[PDB]
Amino acid sequence: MKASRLYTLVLVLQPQRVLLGMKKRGFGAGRWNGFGGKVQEGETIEDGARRELQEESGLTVDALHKVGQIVFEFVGEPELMDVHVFCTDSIQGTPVESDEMRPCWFQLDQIPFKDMWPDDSYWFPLLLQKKKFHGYFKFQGQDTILDYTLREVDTV
């Protein structure tokens, strides 16, 4: 048994494009990703996701919808990362570069998988199909998956 820490991840997914941010420092630096971070004491997971989206991208949204949950384990780290993944298609301002992220839109036939976390190749297609999922990935360092599970679910 390991303990886990709560994180969020938000994908702004529109009919023909998705907003990603280039992580400028910290965990996952150099990879395009959705927006998110640690859940803080007192806030719901969904509200922490909304907060991180605003902090990192400048976007303010009324609602998010849950699309998946991914648990990450790293060799040498006792704590698991329990990542709650959300989407929305509905925005009403423009993204802005933050200290953490440079936002950029990608067409959905140009998803930059080689410059994303390696596990995203497995679960992001499910997100694109609007299928909910649970995943688990064990990493050695930043690049190498040693074990993983991925399943479609009816409820996140």
Ligand SMILES: Nc1nc2c([nH]c(=O)n2[C@H]2C[C@H](O)[C@@H](COP(=O)(O)OP(=O)(O)OP(=O)(O)O)O2)c(=O)[nH]1
């Ligand atoms: N797509 C994808 N996202 C991941 C993976 N692993 C992982 O932690 N994430 C997400 C979850 C969070 O959105 C983010 C990690 O949180 P963070 O380090 O940005 O947290 P934060 O904003 O609170 O921290 P800080 O950088 O402000 O100090 O990366 C992965 O393998 N794939």
Ligand SMILES: [Mn+2]
């Ligand atoms: Mn944070």
Ligand code: NA
């Ligand atoms: Na953050």
Ligand code: NA
């Ligand atoms: Na973050």
